[PDB]
Design a protein around this ligand. Structure first.
Ligand code: HEM
Ligand code: HEM
Lengths: 450, 446
């Protein structure tokens, strides 16, 4: 009945606990100490962090709980607008954009994006083929180059050309700096932050200007590509009969870049980390890649046949889900788990890394990397594995992310042997997402042509 | 390109090769002679037996192959109906029952079945504790008593009371005789037909009566029957009807009892033939089972016992084959073209003897092979089938077998007093016929 709570700081209550550069990992340690639920209080804010499948499966009851905009999402909304990820379910533009965009993100829709994904994947492979002896790979950096260029190409047929640059495209610099300012605001307004504010508005203008120009350029030409922008310029919501307006389309494009690039590149980086730390898994995954990817360019159907590669990605998502939490609110008065009464509007946070370590679901070996857990998807209980959120507010880009990640990891395993030449010590950097900072490897080419 | 084929008998093609009392072992000997794939022809039937991990890993591609009802499963369907094991993947009742029954067969669901499993396991231990000096144990007979009573209790709260009987419960007599008739038809009668129909009515009547009794009672138990009476398929929103529920309960008894008792019998056989392995498993049992009654969590900690069971399943998988058909035209192993509908048989005991996977010591019993599942190549170990048509009772069988074997190793030392010579009887399943041991109690109370 009584709910545990971490240590407090006088008037600031629990808020200073978030004044750390690894807040998700700090919250995981608190969940280890306090259990399946703990209260987190701040000035004018109260929330509850859930860690057990028992309680999270109730929180995922859409008849009782809806998606809440966390403080992080509220700050991101200042440039993501009423895009899909930062809009309330009851806002007209959520259901409208959801209905219009759901078919463009289906598994069948990945057939149309496949060629553009291969374009960037081949650039990644060619970069590593052209490395000199004893040179190494900066894994999260190159994975971020890939995912960002892939969403740029599939999103609105724009080439950031990250593999031609040391310093990223100005749009990316502003987006990254905008996300940093939004996240820094959480653990933070005195007059000294006036420089942060002016820079924040400058970065927002950079993002809007480029995206608005591309939309305007596309409308003035009438050209039709295989990208999401063409789909949004021609799509109509069956319910309202309306299309997305130019402003919301911009917010959707910004959202795809934010919500998609860093989560997906982290997944690829974590997957390669776990593969080089578990050579038996790497051998098993590389064997499948060699057997399935028999052509110089992988086909869509071949990517679907990379079952074990997909198992590797799911197990990487189990241990380190790169979008590590989502927020919910109680639609009405209700009782959670038969002992925690909640009032209408009360907030809940789902700590996904803790859910994925619930020993009552996964057994005692929760910390071991074993893709064989996902050998048969039916053995996974309901709401035990939630790397892509829940219900109608689940990740719309799930099939996009998993197809890109399966394609790229498969090509990496086909074309190179990998060496953990530094015996890299896992150090997880936290931004809006999670990534293994400083993860480096050496790649020895198998000399297989593209 | 050209596919090997065993010796033929004129118009009957390969069919007389199955007119033997050990057909699986005969097929293993053919695979030893002909290799990883051979064609098997009969009047109006063509199938292909696969034995190598190289080809079977392709056959397990669910985008290219689906479960086929072998001739044996088709005959079992005459009393198992459209239960999970004898239904086609495209039948509405398969996916419906699959969605409904999957949560009640999960690892988490074993926590709720554990107490009933302990109930029967304690009866087995007490039977052996009460044997007189120089009396011996008939191993497959007692293991079948245990597994059959365990599924009766966990399945629908029914006590066959096999440890109170010499002659089995009348339902079991009809079930065994029905399975015998189905298998004899493969290698094959008005008396057989009338008897076959008599046994089907016996099985249906008892199961249907228990269902009606449960519905007429309204009581809620921790058994599979309760889950099926209240469960709804999330997809269609529909529950299983009473007739299909009958086929499911009949299926659990058929598909579960003899496969699991065979696993226990083969496991004990291999342990008494390998005293160093037996000592290792017995040491683990004593260290883990520190309470008079094993807990669910303690069974999960019997790691080496579980490896013993997996290695027993490697050498003698008690469900020794399954059948597949090609969903479309496809090429197997880059040299064997197959047309849509072409049938494949997976010879599991031969797959598990692939030296390219397990090394040269394939015939040696070494549970250490299973220390790391990640070191085992894909689709090399398939004692429970494949994919969405894999054994739904896998966690049930392994939990029961780990619990019972663990208690056996804790409470008794075992003697191979006859120096038993392995003789594998073939029914729907495999078992070591005539396997007997002596048990000397360690005098540890329950
Ligand atoms: C491994 C990669 C990814 C992970 C782990 C991930 C995770 C998530 C999670 C947990 C949510 C729900 C957040 C909440 O409830 O507040 C979400 C929502 C969303 N994601 Fe992803 N995501 C990934 C990749 C992508 C990609 C590639 C795209 C776009 C191309 C994308 C676009 C979105 C959108 C638009 C939403 C909001 C959906 C809605 O509310 O209608 N994500 N994602
Ligand atoms: C060591 C013991 C067992 C072994 C070796 C075993 C083996 C198998 C195999 C190989 C299959 C696939 C057959 C095919 O593909 O045609 C299968 C399916 C099945 N088994 Fe088991 N089994 C065992 C125990 C059990 C138990 C205890 C139960 C029930 C409590 C059970 C119920 C089933 C069912 C319902 C199916 C069909 C699943 C479906 O297609 O939806 N089995 N089993």
């Amino acid at each position: 009945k009584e709910m545990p709570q971490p240590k407090t700081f006088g008037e600031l209550k629990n808020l200073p606990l978030l004044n750390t550069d690894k807040p998700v990992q700090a919250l995981m340690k608190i969940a280890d100490e306090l259990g399946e639920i703990f209260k987190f209080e701040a000035p004018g804010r109260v929330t509850r962090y859930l860690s057990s499948q028992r309680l999270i499966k109730e929180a995922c009851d859409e008849s009782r709980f809806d998606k809440n905009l966390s403080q992080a999402l509220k700050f991101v909304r200042d440039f993501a607008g009423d895009g899909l990820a930062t809009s309330w379910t009851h806002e007209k533009n959520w259901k409208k954009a959801h209905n219009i965009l759901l078919p463009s993100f289906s598994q069948q829709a990945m057939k149309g994006y496949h060629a553009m994904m291969v374009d960037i994947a081949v650039q990644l492979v060619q970069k590593w083929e052209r490395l000199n002896a004893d040179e190494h790979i900066e894994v999260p950096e190159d994975m971020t180059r890939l995912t960002l260029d892939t969403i740029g190409l599939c999103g609105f047929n724009y080439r950031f050309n990250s593999f031609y640059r040391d310093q990223p495209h100005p749009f990316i610099t502003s987006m990254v700096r905008a996300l940093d300012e939004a996240m820094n605001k959480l653990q933070r307004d005195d007059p000294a932050y006036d420089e942060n504010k002016r820079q924040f508005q400058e970065d927002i203008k950079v993002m809007n200007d480029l995206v608005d120009k591309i939309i305007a350029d596309r409308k003035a030409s009438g050209e039709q590509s295989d990208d999401l922008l063409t789909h949004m310029l021609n799509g109509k919501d069956p319910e309202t009969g309306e299309p997305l307006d130019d402003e919301n389309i911009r917010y959707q494009i910004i959202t795809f870049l934010i919500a998609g690039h860093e989560t997906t590149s982290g997944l690829l980086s974590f997957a390669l980390y776990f593969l080089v730390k578990n050579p038996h898994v790497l051998q098993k995954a590389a064997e499948e890649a060699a057997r399935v990817l028999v052509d110089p360019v992988p086909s869509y159907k071949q990517v679907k046949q990379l079952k074990y590669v997909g198992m590797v990605l799911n197990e990487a998502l189990r241990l380190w889900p790169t979008a590590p939490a989502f927020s919910l609110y109680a639609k009405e008065d209700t009782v959670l788990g038969g002992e925690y009464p909640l009032e209408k509007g009360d907030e809940l946070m789902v700590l996904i890394p803790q859910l994925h370590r619930d020993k009552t679901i996964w057994g005692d070996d929760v910390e071991e990397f074993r893709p064989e857990r996902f050998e048969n998807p039916s053995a996974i209980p309901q709401h035990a594995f939630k790397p892509f959120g829940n219900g109608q507010r689940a990740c719309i880009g799930q099939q996009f992310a998993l197809h890109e990640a399966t394609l790229v990891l498969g090509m990496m395993l086909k074309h190179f042997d990998f060496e953990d030449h530094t015996n890299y010590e896992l150090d997880i950097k936290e931004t809006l997402t999670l990534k293994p900072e400083g993860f480096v490897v050496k790649a020895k080419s198998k000399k297989i042509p593209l």
